[PDB]
Enzyme design. Sequence first.
Site, PDB file in Angstrom:
ATOM      1  N   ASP A  59     -71.411  25.041  14.168  1.00  0.00           N
ATOM      2  CA  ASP A  59     -71.669  26.196  13.365  1.00  0.00           C
ATOM      3  C   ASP A  59     -72.101  26.172  11.976  1.00  0.00           C
ATOM      4  OD1 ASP A  59     -69.516  25.234  12.093  1.00  0.00           O
ATOM      5  OD2 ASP A  59     -68.081  26.788  13.019  1.00  0.00           O
ATOM      6  N   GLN A  61     -70.815  24.928   9.365  1.00  0.00           N
ATOM      7  CA  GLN A  61     -69.701  25.004   8.532  1.00  0.00           C
ATOM      8  C   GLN A  61     -68.963  23.777   8.476  1.00  0.00           C
ATOM      9  OE1 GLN A  61     -68.123  28.973   9.790  1.00  0.00           O
ATOM     10  NE2 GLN A  61     -68.095  29.560   7.780  1.00  0.00           N
ATOM     11  N   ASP A 138     -70.023   7.970  -8.024  1.00  0.00           N
ATOM     12  CA  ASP A 138     -70.454   6.577  -8.571  1.00  0.00           C
ATOM     13  C   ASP A 138     -70.701   5.411  -7.558  1.00  0.00           C
ATOM     14  OD1 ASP A 138     -67.704   6.286  -8.318  1.00  0.00           O
ATOM     15  OD2 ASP A 138     -67.293   5.835 -10.613  1.00  0.00           O
ATOM     16  N   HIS A 142     -74.049   3.619  -6.579  1.00  0.00           N
ATOM     17  CA  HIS A 142     -73.845   2.011  -6.758  1.00  0.00           C
ATOM     18  C   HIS A 142     -74.288   1.842  -5.538  1.00  0.00           C
ATOM     19  CE1 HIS A 142     -71.603  -1.675  -7.667  1.00  0.00           C
ATOM     20  NE2 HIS A 142     -72.094  -1.791  -6.316  1.00  0.00           N
ATOM     21  N   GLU A 143     -74.334   2.158  -4.294  1.00  0.00           N
ATOM     22  CA  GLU A 143     -74.771   1.730  -3.111  1.00  0.00           C
ATOM     23  C   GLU A 143     -76.244   1.804  -3.073  1.00  0.00           C
ATOM     24  OE1 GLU A 143     -73.287  -0.285  -1.411  1.00  0.00           O
ATOM     25  OE2 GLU A 143     -71.203  -0.161  -2.367  1.00  0.00           O
ATOM     26  N   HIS A 146     -78.435  -0.420  -4.656  1.00  0.00           N
ATOM     27  CA  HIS A 146     -78.689  -1.737  -4.273  1.00  0.00           C
ATOM     28  C   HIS A 146     -79.880  -1.870  -3.426  1.00  0.00           C
ATOM     29  CE1 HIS A 146     -75.205  -4.312  -5.207  1.00  0.00           C
ATOM     30  NE2 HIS A 146     -74.427  -3.569  -4.846  1.00  0.00           N
ATOM     31  N   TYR A 157     -78.150 -12.211  -4.291  1.00  0.00           N
ATOM     32  CA  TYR A 157     -76.665 -11.973  -4.509  1.00  0.00           C
ATOM     33  C   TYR A 157     -75.735 -13.041  -4.476  1.00  0.00           C
ATOM     34  CZ  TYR A 157     -73.106  -8.158  -3.715  1.00  0.00           C
ATOM     35  OH  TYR A 157     -72.309  -7.191  -4.032  1.00  0.00           O
ATOM     36  N   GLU A 166     -75.064  -6.544  -9.326  1.00  0.00           N
ATOM     37  CA  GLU A 166     -73.889  -5.820  -9.364  1.00  0.00           C
ATOM     38  C   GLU A 166     -74.018  -4.753 -10.656  1.00  0.00           C
ATOM     39  OE1 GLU A 166     -70.986  -4.803  -7.654  1.00  0.00           O
ATOM     40  OE2 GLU A 166     -72.403  -5.299  -5.986  1.00  0.00           O
ATOM     41  N   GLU A 177     -73.401   9.643 -12.407  1.00  0.00           N
ATOM     42  CA  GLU A 177     -72.159  10.493 -12.383  1.00  0.00           C
ATOM     43  C   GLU A 177     -72.245  11.430 -13.478  1.00  0.00           C
ATOM     44  OE1 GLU A 177     -68.385   8.507 -11.783  1.00  0.00           O
ATOM     45  OE2 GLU A 177     -67.634   9.165 -13.602  1.00  0.00           O
ATOM     46  N   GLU A 190     -62.935   5.492  -9.732  1.00  0.00           N
ATOM     47  CA  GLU A 190     -61.739   6.229  -9.887  1.00  0.00           C
ATOM     48  C   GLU A 190     -61.371   7.445  -9.105  1.00  0.00           C
ATOM     49  OE1 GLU A 190     -64.517   6.508 -12.055  1.00  0.00           O
ATOM     50  OE2 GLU A 190     -65.137   8.405 -12.054  1.00  0.00           O
ATOM     51  N   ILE A 197     -51.886   6.700  -7.583  1.00  0.00           N
ATOM     52  CA  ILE A 197     -51.823   6.417  -9.058  1.00  0.00           C
ATOM     53  C   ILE A 197     -52.893   6.954  -9.805  1.00  0.00           C
ATOM     54  CG2 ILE A 197     -51.883   4.374 -10.628  1.00  0.00           C
ATOM     55  CD1 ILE A 197     -51.015   2.645  -8.213  1.00  0.00           C
ATOM     56  N   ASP A 226     -66.137 -14.803  -3.948  1.00  0.00           N
ATOM     57  CA  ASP A 226     -66.789 -13.687  -4.364  1.00  0.00           C
ATOM     58  C   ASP A 226     -68.522 -13.825  -4.666  1.00  0.00           C
ATOM     59  OD1 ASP A 226     -67.409 -10.774  -4.817  1.00  0.00           O
ATOM     60  OD2 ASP A 226     -67.079 -10.930  -7.042  1.00  0.00           O
ATOM     61  N   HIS A 231     -68.907  -9.819  -8.590  1.00  0.00           N
ATOM     62  CA  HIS A 231     -68.107  -8.548  -9.000  1.00  0.00           C
ATOM     63  C   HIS A 231     -66.992  -8.576 -10.143  1.00  0.00           C
ATOM     64  CE1 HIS A 231     -69.006  -7.618  -4.476  1.00  0.00           C
ATOM     65  NE2 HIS A 231     -69.455  -6.341  -4.967  1.00  0.00           N
TER      66      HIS A 231
HETATM   67 CA   LIG Z   1     -55.937   6.178  -8.529  1.00  0.00          CA
HETATM   68 CA   LIG Z   2     -66.836   6.636 -12.495  1.00  0.00          CA
HETATM   69 CA   LIG Z   3     -68.250  23.021  12.143  1.00  0.00          CA
HETATM   70 CA   LIG Z   4     -65.431  10.157 -13.057  1.00  0.00          CA
HETATM   71 ZN   LIG Z   5     -72.450  -3.676  -5.131  1.00  0.00          ZN
END
Ligand SMILES: [Ca+2]
Ligand SMILES: [Ca+2]
Ligand SMILES: [Ca+2]
Ligand SMILES: [Ca+2]
Ligand SMILES: [Zn+2]
Length: 316
Positions: A59, A61, A138, A142-143, A146, A157, A166, A177, A190, A197, A226, A231
């Site tokens: 639909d 939606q 973000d 970020h992706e 790359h 990498y 990175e 953002e 974030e 948290i 890593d 990173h």
């Molecule tokens: Ca958090």
């Molecule tokens: Ca951010």
């Molecule tokens: Ca739907």
């Molecule tokens: Ca933010």
């Molecule tokens: Zn990355």
Amino acid sequence: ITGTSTVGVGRGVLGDQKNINTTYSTYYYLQDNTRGNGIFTYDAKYRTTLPGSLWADADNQFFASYDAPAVDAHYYAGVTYDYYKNVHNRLSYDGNNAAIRSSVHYSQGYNNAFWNGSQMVYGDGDGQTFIPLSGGIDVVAHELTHAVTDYTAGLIYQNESGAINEAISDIFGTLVEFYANKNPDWEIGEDVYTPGISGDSLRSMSDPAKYGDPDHYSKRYTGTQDNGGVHINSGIINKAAYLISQGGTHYGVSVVGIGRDKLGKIFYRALTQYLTPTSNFSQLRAAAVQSATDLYGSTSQEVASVKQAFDAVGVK
Ligand SMILES: [Ca+2]
Ligand SMILES: [Ca+2]
Ligand SMILES: [Ca+2]
Ligand SMILES: [Ca+2]
Ligand SMILES: [Zn+2]
């Protein structure tokens, strides 16, 4: 698929309502024909087989909880495309309007998002450490960045080149953002990190050390984990970028900020004109200085600030 372009409505991961571009052909698909060769969003159905099935809805939606990750992956991919086109005059990640593809609901309780060389992939998170990763603009930017890096500088990498790779993704993820003006900040992830948290994030560009990442070359990680700390050591470059834009005194070195727009112009030029697959931190500094020189002149405040920022983080 072939169909009629239309507009649907849905709710994202954070519960916000937004309009998304879809295509109608029996079903309404998450296929945006208004941007380049298109933006396609797929359902991986909790499996690891990619890309999965093009998202189909009866639909137009998208208010079901299962729809949320798809809505945001589709929408934010569009915002990121707009950023690169409007701000840097770049058509998609390859510069020739390549189709952008994303798959959501990848695996089960998967706490990661990544670019697999051909498309973006988003896990749903375990609900504790992460909620659906596509909910963070973000993260999406970020992706997709790359992909841009792969088609331009091609930074390997690993080790220092990987850390630069990175940082570039964190830098442009943050600039996007700010472009979307969605509660912008200099923190990474974030919006989808630790829902239990408040006030934290995965990484910080303003103060990398807050989460244990280095903010000076003397504190760089030299181990093998890593991929040589890609990173981790990115924090050194992220801090430099933050200083170039916002300014400040770091380790006794004062930097006059020149703003986000100029930061973006300098780094985009460095990325597309001077960086190579094996560029290290010292070469990044040279590339950034040359870029600022090309754009503002050798005796400009811009060039001065770039030099000061790198001096502040110990990159000669
Ligand atoms: Ca958090
Ligand atoms: Ca951010
Ligand atoms: Ca739907
Ligand atoms: Ca933010
Ligand atoms: Zn990355």
